[PDB]
Design a binder for these strands. Sequence first.
RNA 1: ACUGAAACUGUAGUAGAACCAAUCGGGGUCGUCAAUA
Length: 88
Amino acid sequence: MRGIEITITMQSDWHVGTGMGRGELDSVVQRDGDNLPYIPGKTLTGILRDSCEQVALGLDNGQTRGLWHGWINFIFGDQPALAQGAIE
RNA sequence: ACUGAAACUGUAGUAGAACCAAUCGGGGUCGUCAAUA
């Protein structure tokens, strides 16, 4: 099911950073292949994931692991780099 | 003889400190004017 879109409307001035500046600039924004500003999909997943995890916390009554947090790992995938021990 | 997965370039930081829009000045007072025939 492709054909869904997300629209982002920027309501204040915005800065997807590059972690660095250049010359006289101390922070510069990411630009796409057309030299235009954009939000990278890795940034967009991270922000959207984080907010579905905010919703999950409420639905899980603050339980950091539970049924609704499992739904985030369903929708957004597990985060195996953070898990430790014998995850089967 | 078979695409790894998953991961927010973010986090903290007041474009600000200093600098008088100011210095001097009585709202005052007296001699003509004009050039020809």
